[PDB]
Scaffold this active site. Structure first.
Site, short mmCIF file in Angstrom:
data_model
loop_
_atom_site.label_atom_id
_atom_site.label_comp_id
_atom_site.label_asym_id
_atom_site.label_seq_id
_atom_site.Cartn_x
_atom_site.Cartn_y
_atom_site.Cartn_z
N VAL A 1 -48.11 -24.76 -22.89
CA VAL A 1 -48.06 -23.32 -22.64
C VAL A 1 -47.08 -23.04 -21.51
CG1 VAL A 1 -50.03 -23.43 -21.07
CG2 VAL A 1 -49.34 -21.24 -22.05
N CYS A 2 -46.26 -22.01 -21.67
CA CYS A 2 -45.29 -21.66 -20.65
C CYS A 2 -45.41 -20.25 -20.11
CB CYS A 2 -43.87 -21.89 -21.16
SG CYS A 2 -43.27 -23.57 -20.90
N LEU A 3 -44.97 -20.08 -18.87
CA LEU A 3 -45.02 -18.81 -18.19
C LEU A 3 -43.80 -18.77 -17.27
CD1 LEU A 3 -47.48 -17.05 -18.83
CD2 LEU A 3 -48.42 -17.69 -16.60
N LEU B 1 -52.38 -14.28 -20.32
CA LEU B 1 -51.50 -14.51 -21.46
C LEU B 1 -52.27 -14.63 -22.77
CD1 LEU B 1 -48.53 -15.10 -22.26
CD2 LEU B 1 -49.11 -17.52 -22.02
N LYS C 1 -37.91 -21.27 -29.10
CA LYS C 1 -37.82 -22.15 -27.94
C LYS C 1 -38.55 -23.47 -28.19
CE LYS C 1 -40.43 -22.20 -24.53
NZ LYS C 1 -40.95 -21.96 -23.15
#
Lengths: 157, 157
Positions: free
Chosen positions: A92-94, A119, B94
């Site tokens: 998971v990205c932020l 999120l 991505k």
């Protein structure tokens, strides 16, 4: 040469144990010899009340690099979750989790976890990490919300 | 007379035709379709020489059909992984790893337009492809003609 990362992680552990959001879990894993492995943390994020994620406890791992906190920690849901911004691998990205973006020393584990929690109910549709959840979210919100509720129940303590 | 390895190394309309009238069979035969990432690579290299001209168009389309039919026909080949990696390599989704930036998206888009109409193509993938081809992206914008055709085709799947 991870002494600098270990000094900070040791303080982050104490700070987290002293005070952290209710329902959240963030504990370093253990090495085979029983000692703490501060570079690899086992975490859990509770679904936000009032949302379709409620009741669920979503587990994820936080991996820190030897050059932490110059670099952000790598976060991965285990197992991978059905969500537009959760990669098939569970990653998971932020923005606050990207070195070339908003990551900085001022960022805390508490911030990251709360950020990931937010999120979950408020996906970033401009930068998905998964094609399946993104597709359903955009083509049938009702169906999407249904898949989320089922997932929330499956991961309830 | 030319060889698949040379074609894939430096793709060109002429090189594809120099493979011979059985070029389609040869591309597929010489590709390890058990590996999704390798199928994506072969597909993009082949489609990169697409040209709206009789001989070239037929050669690319036949090559794509042979390759993708062989890949999809294996009950073990993960079609979702193919799609995910394809989108990554096309710069539409991505990923954690670093991948080359494809210049021209015209060939890939026109090859997909043909692929999605074949019996071997899993229809479950159409909705996902559509979601990412309709999603805003500079590269797709520069190739509006191909983009519009593919979407119009996806609507009929």
């Amino acid at each position: 040469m991870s002494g600098i990362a270990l000094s900070r992680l040791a303080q982050e552990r104490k700070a987290w144990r002293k005070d952290h959001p209710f329902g959240f879990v963030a504990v370093p894993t253990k090495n085979p010899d029983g000692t703490m492995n501060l570079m690899n943390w086992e975490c859990a994020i509770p679904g936000k009340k009032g949302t379709p994620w409620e009741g669920g406890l979503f587990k994820l791992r936080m991996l820190f690099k030897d050059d932490y906190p110059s670099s952000p920690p790598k976060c991965k849901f285990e197992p991978p979750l059905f969500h537009p911004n959760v990669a098939p691998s569970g990653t998971v990205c932020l923005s606050i989790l990207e070195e070339d973006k908003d990551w900085r020393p001022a960022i805390t584990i508490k911030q990251i976890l709360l950020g990931i929690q937010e999120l979950l109910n408020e996906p970033n549709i401009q930068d998905p990490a998964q094609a399946e959840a993104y597709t359903i979210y955009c083509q049938n919100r009702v169906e999407y919300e249904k898949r989320v509720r089922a997932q929330a129940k499956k991961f309830a303590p | 007379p030319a060889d698949v390895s040379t074609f894939l190394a430096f793709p060109s309309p002429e090189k594809l035709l120099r493979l011979g009238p059985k070029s389609s069979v040869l591309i597929a035969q010489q590709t390890d379709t058990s590996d999704p990432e390798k199928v994506v690579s072969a597909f993009l290299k082949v489609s990169s020489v697409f040209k709206d001209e009789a001989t070239v168009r037929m050669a690319v389309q036949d090559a794509v059909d042979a390759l993708m039919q062989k890949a999809f026909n294996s009950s073990s080949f993960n079609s979702n992984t193919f799609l995910t990696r394809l989108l990554v390599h096309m710069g539409l989704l991505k990923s954690e790893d670093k991948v080359k930036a494809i210049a021209n998206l015209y060939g890939p888009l026109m090859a997909l337009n043909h692929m999605v109409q074949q019996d071997y193509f899993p229809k479950a993938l159409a909705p996902l492809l559509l979601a990412f081809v309709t999603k805003p992206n500079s590269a797709l914008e520069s190739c509006s003609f191909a983009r519009h055709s593919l979407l119009q085709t996806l609507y009929k799947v």
